Swiss-Prot record:
Alphabetical list of Pfam families matching this protein: Ribosomal_S19e (PF01090)
GO CC annotation terms, alphabetical: cytosolic small ribosomal subunit
Name the UniProt record assigns to this protein: Small ribosomal subunit protein eS19
GO biological process: ribosomal small subunit assembly; translation
Function: May be involved in maturation of the 30S ribosomal subunit.
Gene behind the chain: rps19e
Origin species: Pyrococcus abyssi (strain GE5 / Orsay)
Amino acid sequence: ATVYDVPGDLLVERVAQRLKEIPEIKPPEWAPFVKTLPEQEDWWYYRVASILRRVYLDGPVGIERLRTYYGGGHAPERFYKAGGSIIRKALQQLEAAGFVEKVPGKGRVITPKGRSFLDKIATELKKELEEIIPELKKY
Ligand SMILES: [Cl-]
């Protein structure tokens, strides 16, 4: 299966778990300082997983385009607050892990390693859904 063949939320969950074992993916200790479930406890892993999937889907894609995609105005020169820092750090860690690269004049793209990483996890998830859902009791 590929990323296209599984739901995004469950894929990001499963990718997040696998990213925990990748040494370069190091939570920056930003989310714990916010007061305003695994997706919260493991926020950074989910964030990086989501961004990796977004690069797979949308690449080539630039930092500012990702920032505005995720944000709650395009201004690539402007001094990044929290959202820009998140994209930048995620992309730095993903590049260090070999999963994304920069293409001059194009943006970030997923590498063959990154693509296979996602597609392997998608294949596992697809198999699980195919097994579990049809076998659930009705009532
Ligand atoms: Cl964090």
